[PDB]
């Protein structure tokens, strides 16, 4: 129950993962 993701981390994992998948 850690600080969960947020709006702007969910649409970020993409840029991190760069349309990995």
Same mark, same amino acid.
């Given at each position: 129950?850690?600080?969960? $993701?947020? &709006? &702007?981390? /969910? /649409? +970020? +994992?993409?840029? $991190?993962? /760069?349309?990995?998948?």
């Amino acid at each position: 129950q850690d600080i969960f $993701m947020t &709006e &702007e981390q /969910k /649409k +970020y +994992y993409n840029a $991190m993962k /760069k349309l990995g998948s």
